Structure 1
Amino acid sequence: SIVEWKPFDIFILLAIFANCVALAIYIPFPEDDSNSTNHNLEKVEYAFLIIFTVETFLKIIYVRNGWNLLDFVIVIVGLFSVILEQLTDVKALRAFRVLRPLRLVSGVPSLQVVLNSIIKAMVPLLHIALLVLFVIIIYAIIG
């Protein structure tokens, strides 16, 4: 009978930012090169994925909400990537970890409504986008 309210509701939100920071100091060296910082960051990512996994069973009581659906996807894909990476374009599958900073938008309703108001102003522009698509197709065929 797990209960959630405000005890860690800011703790997990700050952990999201800490993981975003840890994703910014990882230098992608060419041709599978690396240094000590990346070596430590791999073990830090292990611990960061542990916390996210530990917070998917307590928030399971959710399974249909879009935000929670993405939150569960960016955890299950990370677990699958870790599992299949340990038993070895594997390194390109960890590109789902950049959606974790996007998780922070749902934690702040004040900033969450702004994004909703931005997407809700995109429906009227769909006709113009559809017109642009036909113009592109016609000009490509003419060329």
Structure 2
Amino acid sequence: SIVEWKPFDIFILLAIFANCVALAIYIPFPEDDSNSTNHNLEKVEYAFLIIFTVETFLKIIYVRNGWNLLDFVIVIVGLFSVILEQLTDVKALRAFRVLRPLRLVSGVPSLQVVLNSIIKAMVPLLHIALLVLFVIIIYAIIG
């Protein structure tokens, strides 16, 4: 934990960016089709998952922070998906790896604070949202 101050956070940020770009370069083919690039990206995702679960296990030795909870949730979801694929809907659970770019904001306090300000700005708009919902319900009933 003494040496993990500067390089560990930078390495995790780089890993998140690499996972994001690997997800970007994936081509979803219709009707279970594939190519060689997807086959390589499967192993790339395997390695990224291994790194992520290693980091999650190491960081404990956690749950109070929401971002750490999100990281734990996505890591165990990836483990669940991998175990199910290996021991087997099958790829329907694959959509939970899109949250990897989301945790990049945690590492970016700037983006984070901006995110916190934007989220906190939504409190006054809840009454307007309720009014919109009521108007929608009334008009739907009339229709």
Q: TM-score, normalised by structure 2?
A: 0.96
User: C-alpha separation between the residues in 2 aligned to 1:64 and 1:85?
Assistant: 31
3-state DSSP class of the match of 1:21?
A: helix
Give the gaps of 5 or more residues in structure 2: none
- Quick check: 126-135 or 87-96, which moved more? 87-96
Name the count of aligned residue pairs. Answer: 143
Q: CA RMSD in A?
A: 1.2
Q: How does 1:53-72 map to 2 (within 5 A)?
A: 53-72=53-72
Contact 1:67 1:106 in 2 (8 A): yes
Contact 1:2 1:58 in 2 (8 A): no
User: C-alpha separation between the residues in 1 aligned to 2:123 and 2:66?
Assistant: 19
Deviation (angstroms), 1:81 = 0.5
User: C-alpha separation between the residues in 2 aligned to 1:129 and 1:120?
Assistant: 15
Residue 109 of structure 1: aligned partner: 109
Deviation (angstroms), 1:62 = 1.3
Deviation (angstroms), 1:3 = 5.9
Deviation sequence 1:1-31 (CA, Å, 0-9, x none): 7763112210111100000000011100000
User: C-alpha separation between the residues in 2 aligned to 1:47 and 1:34?
Assistant: 20
Question: Which segments of structure 1 move beyond 2 Å, counting only runs of 4 or more?
Answer: 1-4
User: C-alpha separation between the residues in 1 aligned to 2:86 and 2:107?
Assistant: 32
Deviation (angstroms), 1:85 = 1.2
Deviation sequence 1:107-126 (CA, Å, 0-9, x none): 01112100000000000000
Q: TM-score, normalised by structure 1?
A: 0.96
Deviation (angstroms), 1:45 = 0.3
Deviation sequence 1:35-82 (CA, Å, 0-9, x none): 000000000000000000110112113112111000100100000001
User: C-alpha separation between the residues in 2 aligned to 1:65 and 1:110?
Assistant: 17
